[PDB]
Each structure stands twice: as C-alpha cells, then as structure tokens.
C-alpha cells in the first residue's frame, strides 16, 4: 500500500576526504514526479551545477541531515531545474520516521535544490515540507554523518561531501512501507 519507488539515486559520501560509504535513495516518481525529477536531474549534474561536490552543511543529531546547497554551501543558496524556486507539489507523504527524504524550504512554495534526510520521525514538518523519497541502503552512512563532530551553528567540523552522485534506473516500481528506515 506504500508509495512506489520509481527511481534510485546514489550519493558516495566522504567526510574530510575520508570515504564513508554509499547512500541509496528511492524516489516516489508517481507520487511527486516534479519534485522527484528535480532531485534526479541535480544528482546527474556535474560539480558546481548539481549535487556532486556539494556538502551536508547542516547536521543535527536526533533530527536530520541537510544538504543540496550547491551554490553557497551554507543554506542560503541552491536552485532547481525549473528556475530558482518551485511550488510545493503536494503533501501526500509524511515524515514517517528516520530515513525519509524531504525538501528544505523557506516557507510555502520555495523549493530549490536543498533537501534533508530525517534521522527521527518529524511530525511537526508534515504538510510543510514535500516528502519525496526513502533511504533504501546506507542508513548507516546517514548515521555516520548524523554523529560527525560539529561546530556551533549545526555545521560539520569536517566537510561532509557528496563526492559522487547519479541515478540508477528502476526495473519495476515497488511499494515501500510508510515506516522508519532501519
């Protein structure tokens, strides 16, 4: 009964130049096609133009990890394939638990490139941030990032970099449970 994964995206992660493993995300291309498409294309862009080379600039343990600011690296930048900003596509899905993918924003209809991966269930974000994927593999890599040493301002002391990213196609869309990722 769960939403269908139609596409995969991978992130090969490094912290301060040390490889820490791959995150694999399933995207709900039937539920939020426009949001999913943005993410997939930004994952396919080259550095400075998309996710490769960008960092998780905001990390809050017992909450979420946030990245996708490929133009300013600090939360103030980023842009979508549709222009600087695009509208909230729908709020069909909730932040069911750790390991859900949702768009960062600065209020209604301000989606860019920035996104976060939850590390706990975050009901207060439901209806405010568009949820569009679920972690499929590499939740331990997420947790590694979640626990990385921080500076004040919720910033990793060492850069947490998406060294590489890309899109793996999907056979046959499959349903996933609306539950925390183990």
UniProtKB/Swiss-Prot annotation:
InterPro entries: Cyclophilin-like_dom_sf, Cyclophilin-type_PPIase, Cyclophilin-type_PPIase_CS, Cyclophilin-type_PPIase_dom
A Pfam family the protein falls into: Pro_isomerase
GO molecular function terms attached to this record: cyclosporin A binding; peptidyl-prolyl cis-trans isomerase activity
Residues bearing glycans: 111
Induction: Inhibited by cyclosporin.
GO cellular component terms, semicolon-separated: cytoplasm; intracellular membrane-bounded organelle
Tissue-specificity statement: Embryonic, larval and adult gut cells.
Designated name of the protein: Peptidyl-prolyl cis-trans isomerase 5
Organism: Caenorhabditis elegans
Underlying gene: cyn-5
């Amino acid at each position: 009964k769960g939403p269908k994964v139609t596409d995969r995206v991978y992130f090969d992660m490094e912290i301060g130049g040390k490889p820490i493993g791959r995150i694999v995300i399933g995207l709900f291309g039937k539920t939020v096609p426009k949001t999913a498409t943005n993410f997939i294309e930004l994952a396919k862009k080259p550095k400075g133009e998309g996710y490769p080379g960008s960092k998780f600039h905001r990390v809050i343990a017992d909450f979420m990890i946030q990245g996708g600011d490929f133009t300013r690296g600090d939360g103030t930048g980023g842009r979508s394939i549709y222009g600087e900003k695009f509208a909230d596509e729908n709020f069909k899905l909730k932040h069911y638990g750790a390991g859900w993918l949702s768009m960062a924003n600065a209020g209604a209809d301000t989606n860019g490139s920035q996104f976060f991966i939850t590390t706990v269930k975050t009901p207060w974000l439901d209806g405010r941030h568009v949820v569009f994927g679920k972690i499929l593999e590499g939740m331990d890599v997420v947790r590694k990032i979640e626990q990385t040493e921080k500076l004040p301002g919720d910033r990793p002391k060492q850069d947490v970099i998406i060294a590489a990213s890309g899109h793996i196609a999907v056979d046959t869309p499959f349903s996933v449970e609306r539950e925390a990722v183990v």
